[PDB]
Enzyme design. Sequence first.
Site, PDB file in Angstrom:
ATOM      1  N   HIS A  63       0.800  -1.206   0.000  1.00 39.98           N
ATOM      2  CA  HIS A  63       0.000   0.000   0.000  1.00 39.98           C
ATOM      3  C   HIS A  63       0.844   1.272   0.000  1.00 39.98           C
ATOM      4  O   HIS A  63       0.293   2.353  -0.204  1.00 39.98           O
ATOM      5  CB  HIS A  63      -1.055  -0.011   1.125  1.00 39.98           C
ATOM      6  CG  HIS A  63      -0.546   0.174   2.520  1.00 39.98           C
ATOM      7  ND1 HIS A  63      -0.381  -0.910   3.380  1.00 39.98           N
ATOM      8  CD2 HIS A  63      -0.335   1.318   3.218  1.00 39.98           C
ATOM      9  CE1 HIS A  63      -0.017  -0.387   4.543  1.00 39.98           C
ATOM     10  NE2 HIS A  63       0.019   0.944   4.496  1.00 39.98           N
ATOM     11  N   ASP A 205       1.584  -7.685   2.610  1.00 39.23           N
ATOM     12  CA  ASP A 205       1.727  -6.256   2.339  1.00 39.23           C
ATOM     13  C   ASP A 205       3.158  -5.807   2.183  1.00 39.23           C
ATOM     14  O   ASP A 205       3.720  -5.150   3.077  1.00 39.23           O
ATOM     15  CB  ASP A 205       1.027  -5.470   3.461  1.00 39.23           C
ATOM     16  CG  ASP A 205       0.484  -4.111   3.062  1.00 39.23           C
ATOM     17  OD1 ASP A 205       1.032  -3.500   2.128  1.00 39.23           O
ATOM     18  OD2 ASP A 205      -0.486  -3.659   3.685  1.00 39.23           O
ATOM     19  N   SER A 630       3.726   2.565   8.496  1.00 41.43           N
ATOM     20  CA  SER A 630       3.553   1.578   7.419  1.00 41.43           C
ATOM     21  C   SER A 630       4.896   1.347   6.741  1.00 41.43           C
ATOM     22  O   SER A 630       5.543   2.312   6.380  1.00 41.43           O
ATOM     23  CB  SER A 630       2.606   2.124   6.359  1.00 41.43           C
ATOM     24  OG  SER A 630       1.245   2.035   6.732  1.00 41.43           O
TER      25      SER A 630
END
EC number: 3.4.14.-
Lengths: 695, 697
Positions: A63, A205, A630
């Site tokens: 992402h 991810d 992240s």
Amino acid sequence: EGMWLMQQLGRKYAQMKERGLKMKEYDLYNPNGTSLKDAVVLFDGGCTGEVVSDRGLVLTNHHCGYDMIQAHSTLEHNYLENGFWAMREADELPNKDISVVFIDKIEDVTDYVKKELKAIKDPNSMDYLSPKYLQKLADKKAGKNFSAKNPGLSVEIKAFYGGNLYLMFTKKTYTDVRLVGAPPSSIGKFGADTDNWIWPRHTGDFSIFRIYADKNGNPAPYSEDNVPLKPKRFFNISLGGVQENDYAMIMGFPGTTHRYFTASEVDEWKSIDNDIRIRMRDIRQGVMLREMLADPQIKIMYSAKYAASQNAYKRAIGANWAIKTRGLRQNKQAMQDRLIAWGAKQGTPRYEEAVHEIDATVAKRADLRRRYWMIEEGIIRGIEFARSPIPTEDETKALQASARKEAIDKIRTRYSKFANKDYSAEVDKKVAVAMLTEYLKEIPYENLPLHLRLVKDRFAGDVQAYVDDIFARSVFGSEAQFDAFAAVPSVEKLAEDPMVLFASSVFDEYRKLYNELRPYDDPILRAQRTYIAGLLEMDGDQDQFPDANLTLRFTYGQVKGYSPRDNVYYGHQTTLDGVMEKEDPDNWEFVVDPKLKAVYERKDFGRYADRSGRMPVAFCATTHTTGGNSGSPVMNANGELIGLNFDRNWEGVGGDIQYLADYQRSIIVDIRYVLLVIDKVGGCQRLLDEMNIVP
Amino acid sequence: DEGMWLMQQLGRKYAQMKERGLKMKEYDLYNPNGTSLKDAVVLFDGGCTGEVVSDRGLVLTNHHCGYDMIQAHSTLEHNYLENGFWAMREADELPNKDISVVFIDKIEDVTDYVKKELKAIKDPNSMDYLSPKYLQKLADKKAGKNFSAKNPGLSVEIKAFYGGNLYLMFTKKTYTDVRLVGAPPSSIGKFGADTDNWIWPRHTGDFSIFRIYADKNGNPAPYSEDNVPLKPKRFFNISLGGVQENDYAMIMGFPGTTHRYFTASEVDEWKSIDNDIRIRMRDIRQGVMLREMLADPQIKIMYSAKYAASQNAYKRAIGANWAIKTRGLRQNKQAMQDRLIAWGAKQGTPRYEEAVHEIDATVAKRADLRRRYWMIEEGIIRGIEFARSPIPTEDETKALQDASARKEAIDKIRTRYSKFANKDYSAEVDKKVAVAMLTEYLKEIPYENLPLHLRLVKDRFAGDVQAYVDDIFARSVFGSEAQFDAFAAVPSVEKLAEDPMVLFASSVFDEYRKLYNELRPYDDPILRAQRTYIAGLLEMDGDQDQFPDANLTLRFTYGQVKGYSPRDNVYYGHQTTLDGVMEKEDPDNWEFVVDPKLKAVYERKDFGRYADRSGRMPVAFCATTHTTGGNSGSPVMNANGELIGLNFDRNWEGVGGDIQYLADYQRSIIVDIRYVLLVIDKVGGCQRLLDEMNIVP
Ligand SMILES: COc1ccc(NC(=O)Nc2ccncc2)cc1
Ligand SMILES: COc1ccc(NC(=O)Nc2ccncc2)cc1
Ligand SMILES: [Cl-]
Ligand SMILES: [Cl-]
């Protein structure tokens, strides 16, 4: 429990050693040498990344690299759905508008800034928090010819602890960062929106990039002559995996926290911010869902809009659960009462006066803030025709020369972007009627945007008639209605247009509310400087970390699961088996890649499966993370990479105000699953060979 | 697999049960020639289990078992369903019409007797060996001349077991004066309500209290103001020691049905016909019903019970299909029958392989008919409300064609029309459901197989299902109240004979009966072949590790108090607490409202001797016992035979357990007896019921 400054490593090292840290203090962070800190990057301004090879290979989340993967995707080569694996360095795709920032040096400049600030004069000056003022101070300290004498480098000063501590960062920025590899969206985004903020989690991810530089390793923009960066430090990849209670640590750039909120600020966040967002998005999503489920073409057009609205809606539900069940308000009240009692003891009343100022400001702005959130959630983001075209002053003073044709072409372009392939006027009229009905019952007549007064005055309370009339008479109500206007355009038609008047008056009210509320920020900010100063003077730096501000922090904890509710336990680790349980071929979120399904069936796990022959996927830890973390590297007791942080569970979203030891967990993708996907799905052995993998 | 054992089988299982933790003596649990714990177990109101817990005939069962009795005694003035009921004296206990409790007085093996009587085989294909009429004639011949008159209260019954390979005669004692004594409010008795049905973890206090009444001598007697409480042969002691993970637990009760000896082809049929059709059809029906309920709050009030009723068997089918898909039910049945075929080949007896072939061939032969039957039953008979609209009888039709009998025929038809188009019936919602249900039905069922009236969709309406349904209501006498009254004023049999709703209801019910009649013959060859099939399985592996299918007779099951992992990285423990009730509390959701007396008990931590060692208040627990429908209200026993809980449900991951027990998923959902005693004491304040019980430390 905290997001610690690198300066605080010394003060925390003894506790970290007790919790299992084995590496030497300066091998992790050295203020005047090379350390693991030198392999951490701020990826594309809002994510974290890490250098994993001597040739500048970088890992971050899927992402995080999603826009770069999407920009290089075509109908012929869909890298977003099928993945991308550059089989040679020359095949790695450059990316426009990308950056990686290294934190070269960090220095405490508190005394310098506090001395410079003494020359202010106005005691209410907000220069102590001003990026422009602090940049002037940073430039004065670094030097006039700093960026030319030290190329690639730049300096920056940031405020911490509400203006009680200042740090100067020397940053090195690289803008030639190329796409190297990415799993298909079936792996990179497996849970998709259903599993967002969810633990257990089965999402791989990750995405892979590479930093490029000039012949000397200095930053240089994209050039076909650029060569991979040989960095001064990179992470070794561990294959030992994780066990329950193992020590884990993270470095990254957490964006924001509100750890020094007063109890009144927690009440406001719950009763205004969260309750309005929850109520308004629940009405909006409810109408959108009925329409999407009834017409498959509406599902295609409104899916991304529905998903975007749900994200912060779920965050608000999670935050309100913590306020309700974990006593966030009570713990803030206890914090400020302990300071007020200590200040009374010392004979210094300024701390109690500071909490009172914050409380009085929150109380004073309550009706304005409620009106702002009501219009923002209700209309500005709730109703699509609120963002319909408004003729500029240049466009009206052109319609009333052939600059009339230039005006109509600019207005036409904006109308086309509003009424695009994904816009349904029928669905928008249905959403507006539900959203305005709620808005009109919560905002009184004398506080309404001017055009909304017509509901009572002209339409006798009929919201459906008011919305029907806006579309029936507006030049932006249909393509035919616009073309009829464009053929015979009069400024009189535009000045009395019901959609133009609606959009204009809702945006006027939104700006009036914003401007009236802005002054209330400064007294709270000034009072928080005194409030946090007292908290630090009373209890000190250890337990009381500075609020996140997009600067490099470290956090430590253990690989550990948690009990979400009575009689239910969520372990610390998910497996490939869990991906296969969730497989639904007819649900786009839970489709499983055939190469991955094959690996699972054949147990082709190589050196990546655990001691029991199970293939791990993700794990969770008691580290304290937030947005900005992240892609953060997750380290062993020895500093070796064991995973990448990619999310946090919803039970921990209230952790931005108060860390929740028994619920809050960082959701991390296991590095053994990352290598399994690179190897058996992408077949990119050259990337495995490039990394320093430890047994 | 992990059985529902006959009482006769307690002897040959006893050593395994003792090795697993049982401490009580064999004959204290079951003795055929004397008093045992078996005497305190009852069949409550024909389909639930109960247990006697005092020397004055007090009985515990589930709240959902005594629900109708609680509802019948509830008024606007005294709403016992909502607030609970606690009779503060025996004279205050409410009698109940049409209630019964059945004790299993004696159980006898009559296999040789029945097999000898059957030798008067006038036809080898006779189904008398499974006939309730034939077996009752045999039971009456054995028990004697006017047995019921000579032993008032007693009755005799013979049942077939193992597909007709074992027969047992039961001597039953039936009491019909069973009074309501106590019940928690519905917010406790049905806490999860429909959301938590088939769910573990579970926080429901599913219990209600009754009392058996009898004449002066303890003999059964119908309700009389002169009846006195029953002094039973045996009653359960209540334990307060509670449960721990891995503790031995056992249950006695009346499990209704299982299909443990299904062939692999019967499992395929159950999945691909029965379950897939029920899943697909109820998903279409529930989908339309939900949109309408969410759009109009008045439709939500009218269709809520219909929606919930449809969801129950829909969830069961999803749970059953998950087991077939993920637990290898088909494969294990295939392995069972292949083991038998290989052993039969070794013994030189081919009748077992011939029996499995007969079952397979019958299943294959009835596939299209069974598909058509389930399609019409789920799709129309249950799916569309106007399928059950009024059909004029042969006599009602005749009356309308020269006497005052005409006004009697119209009054009878009106009464039925009023029951069809009641306060909960919406013609608009029914037209929406029918259009979706018929569209899917017309897609699956070809023209030549359709009920006669449905042929009009293609022939008269050019495939427009909406037009066909619109026309049924627009022209039908039962389409609206005004349309009916216009008919009732000038009623002609000609109007009724051509009525589109009458013709629809008539032809869908004609086709439903034609399909049923064509499918009935296929049951008997399967039944006869199962007698040979189970005989082989018993001859090969013994009447030891393969239990007889449940048939509403008394069985025992044993296991351990243990949780399970439902999916990767998730563990559900063995015990829920009061804390879990408080986490689920939602004041605006009728299912999750928490009683104020209970909320204060929790806040005050007023748990008395009912809390566990850690001071937590237990609510429910789960066990590896093998239960099914009919086991609701069953007593749960300790290693010592003391009552530790009442069974009230099973998790959805275990619904496939009726075909194959799932050791790692299947659990019985039991309400802790400490929680029952806490609710009686601190929520009902009924100390007299606690004093009446024999509570052990
Ligand atoms: C608001 O009105 C309602 C009325 C009844 C129900 N529940 C219900 O019918 N449950 C059920 C459970 C098991 N088997 C069949 C049915 C729910 C809501
Ligand atoms: C549809 O395909 C699959 C279905 C189930 C599984 N997993 C499995 O056996 N379940 C499991 C339950 C509890 N803990 C771990 C695992 C794998 C694939
Ligand atoms: Cl570097
Ligand atoms: Cl299992």
